Write a protein that binds this ligand. Structure first.
Ligand SMILES: O=P(O)(O)CP(=O)(O)OC[C@H]1O[C@@H](n2cnc3c(NCc4ccccc4)nc(Cl)nc32)[C@@H](F)[C@@H]1O
Ligand SMILES: O=P(O)(O)CP(=O)(O)OC[C@H]1O[C@@H](n2cnc3c(NCc4ccccc4)nc(Cl)nc32)[C@@H](F)[C@@H]1O
Ligand SMILES: [Ca+2]
Ligand SMILES: [Ca+2]
Ligand SMILES: [Zn+2]
Ligand SMILES: [Zn+2]
Ligand SMILES: [Zn+2]
Ligand SMILES: [Zn+2]
Lengths: 521, 521
């Protein structure tokens, strides 16, 4: 019997340096976690101890911190090569800077194979990207070979900017012929490594004949066997076992996000590549694991270029700016109220009509909290992690019916850590989750524009309201198809980080609170 | 039979120039009201038409606009002499600048008798103020004489700064011997002119034998017979008839406030001074009445010194700043939310503990609205009328029990246009007016200080909270005795107008709304 050790990371999101426990900028260095230097110490320790080791990434290394704003993927290719990753699957955020933002910094500079079987290149692009990413790779591991098939979220054209020359096929339809090709090459050990979320990973384990292990990403799934070591609540045991349609037990693994944990799974295979057993758990990369000095000195060299983004203080916060998913995707979060107050302030600074009183913001668009214990200081860097996408805060004209539909969509699948949960400004919404989806909004009061003194009045279906929202939502992003389809007017506004930055500078000291903007019945 | 015409003003409050309909600074001159120039045209017209005329003031000429901030009462003595007032009764605001602020500008410069029978001077002051104000005056009117007895609110030591050398006696106890003295002088026509409010005026008409007419002030009572000409709702017919204990019908009159109306009452007396009948109504001093050119040119001369208080713009409002009594004494008003946000902002600008999240503000302390149609401009003058008293915004430490008592007091006599109604910041209060007084607060949630993210939690009786409030409330003003008696700590803060001014300058453009801080069940 032959034992393989799979070490996996996913949704790291430019978290190259060690972070606070909430994955925001490290301040109190003694209690910091993750980062590539720490991950390198743990990986090295496992390589010294285990004979057959694979270090894999299931996508979304791109986007999240000033590391990616400045280096545009050169930091990813450099440090992923430094850690000696054996393979990576393409994620949706790898396309955020177009195909060009993927090809030049990453595909051309990685010393490891970058995979995706369901991505087909066509037209002019076909010749330009050919062989820069592969559907599968056969990797020698000790005296054995292990086949790795890659996959990327089929919904990527709506999540990113991959362009019109890439076709995103159904994962299962595209993976089965590639697995069948590995089987003809007599590769009997097969890992499906990809980026579509835990729900699709379970479908790949059930339906794709020949896959032994599924290593996923995109849904930031925390899986654990026993008592977890930190604040993350497990969504199931590690590994998650799926029984395939052909009757084989298939472990499905995921390792949360932000490089806080290193996934770790041991598979005992027999001579014919049948999985005998599997055990593991994600490894919390805390303070106990010391950062590698060589990687850390290299991280510090690259850090010089970034320091001029933290030299200038925009203002102060005397309160924790809760930009976490556990807060901003489930209820009113003060980071969400702050950003919506900044949007309304930027639009009301230059103004019955002409005015704009309301704001809506997808909770999943807020990508990091900001801590108040660092002397209170807010820099362009702390703000760069909250709002990393470089989008705009647009003005839209919506019928009350359209706004009520967007609010119904906001909680249609409440309890899935779905980022469509809306943060608001100039709106008082009450939800009753005991009611059937599509009828959960029990109260929707909005701030009048056509009134001398502003006050909250019930939303009228036949009335038309002006709403400030991300360009992402206006384009039907996060399943807000009703906004794109039913809007009556759409104007482009200022860059997201600049709107929030000018506001923080004006206010000097900020203290946003949870005020009852969103309530539950 | 002999007919007397009584023209009366009360609670003018430094409204020397014509004002908007809400009694704030005149902008659209075509639809402006009141002012001394307009009042002079109407009074002159009545003097040309009627043989026996008395022009009286029932108090509170002092405090309200930049006219009083700058001239400290010299404008009152000058323009009241110009209009040829025959008498004035002392009001509580005439003592706001101490006895010295009353003696030097007004008592020493008025060419008319200034009256109060229930104010007794003692100790060192007795010799200094002797004869500068009188208990009564006998005025020749045509071939007849009319006696005028004055009175001032017994509660003045708590409302103002009259000092420890003036005794404020019971109105009825002090008025009866002065009326009896006029009766021995065979004065058969007697007017009681004073400043204690409509409720006390009715008691004087009922109890003081020999008073024929009561001309009052202090409660800003609007009395009208028929259909009123403006937005003011009558509190009863004009005149209000009180049947005395000795069986005589006694008219009681009051003419609202801010010089918007001129009270006008005709009394037909018989040969023995018995009131036969009385009819009248307040005269709305609107645009139809033209301003006297001589008084207006004199008003413009004095206006030069004031212009450097309007030359500098503090910021802009895009919304009407509702500082009216009809709003701020009955429900949440946006002027109240603004001032409470300015108080919390001034105290949080330099800060679990040390912080202050809550604000309370007596609604009656907000003395004027600000209009947004004047290009949006907010000047030191517009702000001077909102906050004319020159008080401070103090920090106090209160038990939850004390705060609940202050909120119970806030609505104990709801529906009387009582200024104790509280405006708030960092507090969510719900009242149920159908409940018995002392038990009307059904919900009282406050913003936590001892929490990383601020949020609204129920008030705990056994807990201690930090509240920013006017120095007036800390001293038990407006019947908030529980604040003065039960507070655990009291620190003096910055001047009220400066706190609000620095905030408006920081914000640049303001838009406070009615947000659900105060609700009714
Ligand atoms: O890491 P992911 O692959 O995104 C999976 P997740 O559970 O961590 O985050 C999902 C949430 O994030 C929201 N979201 C993602 N990208 C964007 C985004 N920009 C991405 C982008 C799109 C097109 C071109 C370039 C960049 N803008 C906004 Cl406002 N919201 C976004 C939105 F997609 C959702 O609420
Ligand atoms: O014109 P008035 O004689 O006052 C009768 P009104 O029905 O028009 O106003 C009553 C309201 O006004 C409130 N109030 C009055 N004076 C003050 C005041 N300053 C007066 C003062 C007191 C002592 C010395 C000097 C000035 N400060 C504050 Cl915050 N609130 C006040 C307080 F008294 C009440 O809520
Ligand atoms: Ca196998
Ligand atoms: Ca008489
Ligand atoms: Zn991701
Ligand atoms: Zn993803
Ligand atoms: Zn008054
Ligand atoms: Zn008064």
């Amino acid at each position: 019997m032959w034992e393989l050790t799979i070490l996996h990371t996913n949704d790291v999101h430019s978290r190259l340096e060690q972070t606070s426990e909430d994955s925001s900028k490290c301040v109190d260095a003694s209690r910091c976690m993750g980062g590539v230097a720490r991950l390198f110490t743990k990986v090295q320790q496992i390589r010294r101890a285990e004979p057959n080791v694979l270090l894999l990434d299931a996508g979304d290394q791109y986007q999240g911190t000033i590391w990616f704003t400045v280096y545009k993927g050169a930091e990813v290719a450099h440090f992923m090569n430094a850690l000696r990753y054996d393979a990576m699957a393409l994620g949706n955020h790898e396309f955020d800077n177009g195909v060009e933002g993927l090809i030049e910094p990453l595909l051309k500079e990685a010393k490891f194979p970058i995979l995706s079987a369901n991505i087909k290149a066509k037209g002019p692009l076909a010749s330009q990207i050919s062989g820069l990413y592969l559907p599968y790779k056969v990797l020698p591991v000790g005296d054995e070979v292990v086949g790795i098939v890659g996959y990327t979220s089929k919904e990527t054209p709506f999540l990113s900017n991959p362009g019109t020359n890439l076709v995103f096929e159904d994962e299962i339809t595209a993976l089965q012929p590639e697995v069948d090709k590995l089987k003809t090459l007599n590769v009997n050990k097969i890992i499906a490594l990809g980026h579509s979320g835990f729900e699709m990973d379970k479908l790949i384990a059930q339906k794709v004949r020949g896959v032994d292990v599924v290593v996923g990403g995109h849904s930031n799934t925390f899986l654990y066997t026993g008592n977890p070591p930190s604040k993350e609540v497990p969504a199931g045991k590690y590994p998650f076992i799926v029984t395939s349609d052909d009757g084989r037990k298939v472990p499905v693994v995921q390792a949360y996000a932000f490089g806080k944990y290193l996934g770790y799974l041991k598979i005992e295979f027999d001579e014919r590549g049948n999985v005998i057993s599997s055990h593991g758990n994600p490894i919390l990369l805390d303070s106990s694991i010391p950062e590698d000095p060589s990687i850390k000195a290299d991280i510090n060299k690259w850090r010089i270029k970034l320091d001029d983004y933290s030299t200038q203080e925009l203002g102060k916060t005397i309160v924790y700016l809760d930009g976490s998913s556990q807060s901003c995707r489930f209820r009113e979060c003060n980071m969400g109220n702050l950003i919506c107050d900044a949007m309304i302030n930027n639009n009301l600074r230059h103004a019955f009509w002409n005015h704009v009183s309301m704001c809506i913001l997808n909770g999943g668009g807020i990508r990091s909290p900001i801590d108040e214990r660092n002397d209170g200081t807010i820099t362009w860097e702390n703000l760069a992690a909250v709002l990393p996408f470089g989008g705009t805060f647009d003005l839209v004209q919506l019928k009350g019916s359209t706004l009520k539909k967007a609010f119904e969509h906001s909680v249609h699948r409440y309890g899935q850590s779905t980022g469509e949960f809306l943060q608001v400004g100039g709106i008082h919404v009450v939800y009753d989750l005991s009611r059937k989806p599509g009828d959960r909004v029990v109260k929707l009061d909005v701030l009048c524009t056509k009134c001398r003194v502003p006050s909250y009045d019930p939303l009228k279906m036949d009335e038309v309201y002006k709403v400030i929202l991300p360009n992402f939502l206006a384009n039907g992003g996060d399943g807000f198809q009703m906004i794109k389809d039913e809007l009556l007017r759409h104007d482009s506004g200022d860059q997201d980080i600049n709107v929030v930055s000018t506001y923080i500078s004006k206010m000097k000291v900020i203290y946003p609170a949870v005020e009852g903007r969103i309530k539950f019945s």
